[PDB]
Amino acid sequence: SRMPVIKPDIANWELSVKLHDKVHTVVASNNGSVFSVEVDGSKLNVTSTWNLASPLLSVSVDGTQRTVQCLSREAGGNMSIQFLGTVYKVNILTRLAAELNKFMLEKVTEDTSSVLRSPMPGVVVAVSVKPGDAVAEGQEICVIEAMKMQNSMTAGKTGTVKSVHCQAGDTVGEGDLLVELE
Amino acid sequence: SRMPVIKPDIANWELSVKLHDKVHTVVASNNGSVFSVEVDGSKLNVTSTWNLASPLLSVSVDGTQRTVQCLSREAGGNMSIQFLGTVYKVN
Amino acid sequence: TSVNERIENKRRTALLGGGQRRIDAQHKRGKLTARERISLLLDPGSFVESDMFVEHRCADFGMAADKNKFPGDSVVTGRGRINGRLVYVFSQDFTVFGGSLSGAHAQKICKIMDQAITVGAPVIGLNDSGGARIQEGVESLAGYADIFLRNVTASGVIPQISLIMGPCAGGAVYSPALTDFTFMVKDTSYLFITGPDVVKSVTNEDVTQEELGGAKTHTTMSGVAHRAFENDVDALCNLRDFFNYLPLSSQDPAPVRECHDPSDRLVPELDTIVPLESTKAYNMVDIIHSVVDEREFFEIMPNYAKNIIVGFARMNGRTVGIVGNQPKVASGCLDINSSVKGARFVRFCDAFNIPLITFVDVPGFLPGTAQEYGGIIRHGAKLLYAFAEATVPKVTVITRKAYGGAYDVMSSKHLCGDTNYAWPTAEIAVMGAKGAVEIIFKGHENVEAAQAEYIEKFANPFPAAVRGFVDDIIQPSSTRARICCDLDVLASKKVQRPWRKHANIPL
Amino acid sequence: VASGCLDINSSVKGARFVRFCDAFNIPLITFVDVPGFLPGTAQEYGGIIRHGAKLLYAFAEATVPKVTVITRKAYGGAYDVMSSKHLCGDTNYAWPTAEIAVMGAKGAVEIIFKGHENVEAAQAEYIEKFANPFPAAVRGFVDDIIQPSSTRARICCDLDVLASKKVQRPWRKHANIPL
Amino acid sequence: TSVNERIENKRRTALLGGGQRRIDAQHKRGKLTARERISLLLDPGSFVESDMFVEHRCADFGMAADKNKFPGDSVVTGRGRINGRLVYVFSQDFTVFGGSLSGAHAQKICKIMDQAITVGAPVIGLNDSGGARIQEGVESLAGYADIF
Ligand SMILES: CCC(=O)SCCNC(=O)CCNC(=O)[C@H](O)C(C)(C)COP(=O)(O)OP(=O)(O)OC[C@H]1O[C@@H](n2cnc3c(N)ncnc32)[C@H](O)[C@@H]1OP(=O)(O)O
Numbered sequence A: 001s002r003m004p005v006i007k008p009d010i011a012n013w014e015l016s017v018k019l020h021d022k023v024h025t026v027v028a029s030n031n032g033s034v035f036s037v038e039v040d041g042s043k044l045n046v047t048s049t050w051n052l053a054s055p056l057l058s059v060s061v062d063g064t065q066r067t068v069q070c071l072s073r074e075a076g077g078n079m080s081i082q083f084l085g086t087v088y089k090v091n092i093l094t095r096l097a098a099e100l101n102k103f104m105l106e107k108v109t110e111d112t113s114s115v116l117r118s119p120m121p122g123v124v125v126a127v128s129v130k131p132g133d134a135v136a137e138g139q140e141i142c143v144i145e146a147m148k149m150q151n152s153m154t155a156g157k158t159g160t161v162k163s164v165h166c167q168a169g170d171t172v173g174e175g176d177l178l179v180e181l182e
Numbered sequence B: 001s002r003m004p005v006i007k008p009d010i011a012n013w014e015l016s017v018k019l020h021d022k023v024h025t026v027v028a029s030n031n032g033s034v035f036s037v038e039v040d041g042s043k044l045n046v047t048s049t050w051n052l053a054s055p056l057l058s059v060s061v062d063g064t065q066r067t068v069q070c071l072s073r074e075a076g077g078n079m080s081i082q083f084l085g086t087v088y089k090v091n
Numbered sequence C: 001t002s003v004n005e006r007i008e009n010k011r012r013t014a015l016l017g018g019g020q021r022r023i024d025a026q027h028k029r030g031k032l033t034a035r036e037r038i039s040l041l042l043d044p045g046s047f048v049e050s051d052m053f054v055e056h057r058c059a060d061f062g063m064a065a066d067k068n069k070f071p072g073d074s075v076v077t078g079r080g081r082i083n084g085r086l087v088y089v090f091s092q093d094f095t096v097f098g099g100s101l102s103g104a105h106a107q108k109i110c111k112i113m114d115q116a117i118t119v120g121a122p123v124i125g126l127n128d129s130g131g132a133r134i135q136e137g138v139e140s141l142a143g144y145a146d147i148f149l150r151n152v153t154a155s156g157v158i159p160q161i162s163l164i165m166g167p168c169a170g171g172a173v174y175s176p177a178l179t180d181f182t183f184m185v186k187d188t189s190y191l192f193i194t195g196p197d198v199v200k201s202v203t204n205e206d207v208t209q210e211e212l213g214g215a216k217t218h219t220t221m222s223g224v225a226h227r228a229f230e231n232d233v234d235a236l237c238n239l240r241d242f243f244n245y246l247p248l249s250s251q252d253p254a255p256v257r258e259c260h261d262p263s264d265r266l267v268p269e270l271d272t273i274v275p276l277e278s279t280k281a282y283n284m285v286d287i288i289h290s291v292v293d294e295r296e297f298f299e300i301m302p303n304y305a306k307n308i309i310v311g312f313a314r315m316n317g318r319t320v321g322i323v324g325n326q327p328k329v330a331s332g333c334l335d336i337n338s339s340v341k342g343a344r345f346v347r348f349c350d351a352f353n354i355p356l357i358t359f360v361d362v363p364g365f366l367p368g369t370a371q372e373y374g375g376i377i378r379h380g381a382k383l384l385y386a387f388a389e390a391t392v393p394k395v396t397v398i399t400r401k402a403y404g405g406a407y408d409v410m411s412s413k414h415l416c417g418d419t420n421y422a423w424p425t426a427e428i429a430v431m432g433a434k435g436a437v438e439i440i441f442k443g444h445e446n447v448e449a450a451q452a453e454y455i456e457k458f459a460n461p462f463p464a465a466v467r468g469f470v471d472d473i474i475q476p477s478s479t480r481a482r483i484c485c486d487l488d489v490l491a492s493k494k495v496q497r498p499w500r501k502h503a504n505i506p507l
Numbered sequence D: 001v002a003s004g005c006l007d008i009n010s011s012v013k014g015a016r017f018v019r020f021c022d023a024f025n026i027p028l029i030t031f032v033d034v035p036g037f038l039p040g041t042a043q044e045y046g047g048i049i050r051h052g053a054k055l056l057y058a059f060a061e062a063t064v065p066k067v068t069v070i071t072r073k074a075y076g077g078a079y080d081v082m083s084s085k086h087l088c089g090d091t092n093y094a095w096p097t098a099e100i101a102v103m104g105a106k107g108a109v110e111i112i113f114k115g116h117e118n119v120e121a122a123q124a125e126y127i128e129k130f131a132n133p134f135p136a137a138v139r140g141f142v143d144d145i146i147q148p149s150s151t152r153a154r155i156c157c158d159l160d161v162l163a164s165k166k167v168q169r170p171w172r173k174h175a176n177i178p179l
Numbered sequence E: 001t002s003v004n005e006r007i008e009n010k011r012r013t014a015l016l017g018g019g020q021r022r023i024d025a026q027h028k029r030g031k032l033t034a035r036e037r038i039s040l041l042l043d044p045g046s047f048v049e050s051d052m053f054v055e056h057r058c059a060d061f062g063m064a065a066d067k068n069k070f071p072g073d074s075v076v077t078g079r080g081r082i083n084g085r086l087v088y089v090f091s092q093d094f095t096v097f098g099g100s101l102s103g104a105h106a107q108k109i110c111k112i113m114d115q116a117i118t119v120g121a122p123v124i125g126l127n128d129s130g131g132a133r134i135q136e137g138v139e140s141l142a143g144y145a146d147i148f
């Protein structure tokens, strides 16, 4: 009551929707429970109750009944949507954000998921591996022990171990290399 | 108590006292109930109780007993003082 | 030439600012202009520009030449809305005199600072400056002082958010220290008083621009920046989302928004998160994400002081602040860095009527001379103070460890808390069984036998609960339901405190 | 000590003291002689920015009498941090040896005349005009320039008339110090 | 030239204000100067002058002329006492640009207005002015608005 809020009168949402390697032009408008969406000239009508908290969202698209799951959302437009069992990555920007985003530098960093370093100083009490051992994503590799706890270090890469640099009984600091994957 | 008032430390009052057609140099200082006044080099001591509301002000000037009346005062220095029956105008 | 022609010519120049060639360079560097950044931040069409025709009044150094006067004098100021909610903004334009601060520059920013305080609307600044404009001399120093005075006056009255979108040097680098949150853009924004040129000239040390004041340094090591975002477009998209959490003024209650997440659902996933073995760590974030509405959590300083987690979330539509321990890092112990981040967050949320939820799992304090000589005592008092003086709802749940003085520091009930829940795995004690029993039975025989009896009686949450320290012991799966119930009845809470000119925080 | 520069440790001690004195209505006297901030990675990585804001905040929010005298240097942002008049100060005095500037003559002139010939000749003119307390005083930054011998008398006069000072500030549940 | 010499030279000019010849004319017309009026009004020795070294910043129509600068910019401001009681005063000096009002002129008066309100002391103004200083233009109009 102190600060009136005025809902923007947005009649049309102009979106740039990037899939794998294509960018599609999509314009949507709301008519209540149904969104009228033009996808590169094709007219679709998506009707739902749009309960945004449920893990299962039931939609009807031009009479076709679909069930989809939204797994993650980011403010930057990234959405992870499972459609017919497969997770698709879509980046939805507004027209303005997409037009200006072209001015950003395409910097690329290195993925160093094979280099497993100690997150915490202490004594190494277990190593689950030797070179050649299979490693799954999330697999425990090393356990460190400081202030009588068991900090567990897991792999971020599937593969086999190339080298084990620190053994049980060794003392390691923060950032020291424990195991190197292939 | 909110706004302390500090009495100016005025040790000497240097006055220019104009009578009829003469201007005299007078310097006065306060020593309590008595003012020590130098009038063109002459030393006088004026002792009184200085009750400023009474129509009759009794003063003693170097042992000489006088009664005077102050009839009017102005902020501009004008005073009308009756001395020995005669009203004198002093600025 | 008519007056209308002159007006149109000034409008066109104000939009170009420093000129098209500088704008071209602005994009080459991978940066947006000050006006493009505002268009992204605010609701389309909601922005109204103020004082677009103001120019400097400088005269020395030939700064009073035609080729030297620009309209707008390096700042874009005005007002708008984000999702219908009133907000004031300003953005510094680097293409005009390097974004340096003039007298008139500051004046325009102060004007926005005064309107926002009077009405009670947040101010979001987009900072990018090369420092003071030396051509004016001391006029720019007064500019900084006036801005600083407004930033202090607005504290606890309106939220102040500062997003850094480029370099910042000189006196300008202190405004984010007075605002509530500071955000940066990775590899684009810098914060430092003097550049590497001065460091090399003064002392025999070798440093580059990124090492001295880059975004990675301030979000990972110094604890100055609350979060860095990858680029300009993502930074403003996340800023809009962050804005939606906060009230417009401290006179307003925490905002409540439409929510589809049932408030009475259970979270069975919690019953097995906390191991029975005391030396096994777990990720506190798994608990936070499962309790909060629709599993959305906004984490602050993800890479700094990782042993304590603070951030924003909603429960049943209402914005709340969450503080908790992270047992994975340094056993969940308190240290200097964690106390600084915690106290700052708690105090902001209290000032703007945002309830606090505390997830306690803390075995004590980080030992060692590194902390003793660092003033761990003086710094730990900051977090205890921030909780003790709070007047907003405080809901504490203890998930496992609470040993020693850390019990009270992490918002215990005896600091005017509202409710305090324990999970069956909680243990509240002055210290663990080993220390307590060896000290109590010091020099006695059969200490291990006495320890077995001690553990059976005290190694559990009951000797504290039966004394009134804990209100209930709940199945972890019900945690969300219990918190939701408390938040919706403590929201009308009001308390009084003795009058004091101002608080005196231990510092 | 350290040329009189501000650093992390000095800001912590200063801010704490200033805040206590303000809370209990004890006037503040400031003696300014500060060339800037202590440079180096030891301070940058230590959060010198976050910590310096503590002393600026402590002065800016003060509501008790503040009397500042500048005895010599006041360069850069340190001028405002050390309780400058534009932070709701009551009086600000300079001694004849005071110099108020964004930076010293060397930095300011080489930056202003960057790439120009006869910079040293321009520096001589710059020093004569700006290396003194006057370009600040004529703009209202300084109330008077006093013979140092009179400093005590001037301060005493201000303290005995600012003691009845009262100001208002917008209501806030509590203050939000940068920490 | 040392800084102390420059300071002394500014002090001497601030006391003369518009200059001795102007002061001579001031007396010929039967008027006291702004500083003589304050000395009469306030308790002897109680007056403390503020911002005596402030000069205008205006540059236009030859105002940037050193021969056009007058320390004090046509007003004498400060504080004192009458019979021991605190009072703030200011007095406009007609001998400096006719006593016309500049931006800086008003600023100094406003400064006195703000200190007096904060402590709770009366303000006594001695006014004498030819109006706005047209060389600055609209700066003097803002001056009036702030005083009002
Ligand atoms: C200490 C007390 C204070 O608060 S006053 C401190 C003032 N000192 C400074 O900040 C020095 C200015 N420079 C720096 O700090 C750094 O070198 C900066 C400029 C931040 C690094 O940014 P960088 O990307 O290298 O920009 P740059 O040096 O090419 O400058 C870009 C354009 O802006 C200009 N600029 C910059 N600073 C000023 C300034 N203070 N006054 C006037 N103009 C300035 C530059 O000349 C440049 O314009 P151009 O590209 O040469 O046409």
Ligand SMILES: *C(=O)CCCC[C@@H]1SC[C@@H]2NC(=O)N[C@@H]21
Binding pocket: A147, A148, C333, C363, C364, C365, C366, C367, C404
């Ligand atoms: C092993 O037996 C001893 C561990 C050290 C004590 C720990 S370190 C962190 C906690 N804080 C504290 O004061 N003691 C606990």
Ligand SMILES: *C(=O)CCCC[C@@H]1SC[C@@H]2NC(=O)N[C@@H]21
Binding pocket: C193, C194, C198, C201, C202, D005, D035, D036, D037, D038, D039, D076
């Ligand atoms: C010598 O020519 C350079 C000295 C270094 C600069 C000094 S160090 C302390 C002051 N603060 C600052 O930012 N610069 C000054």
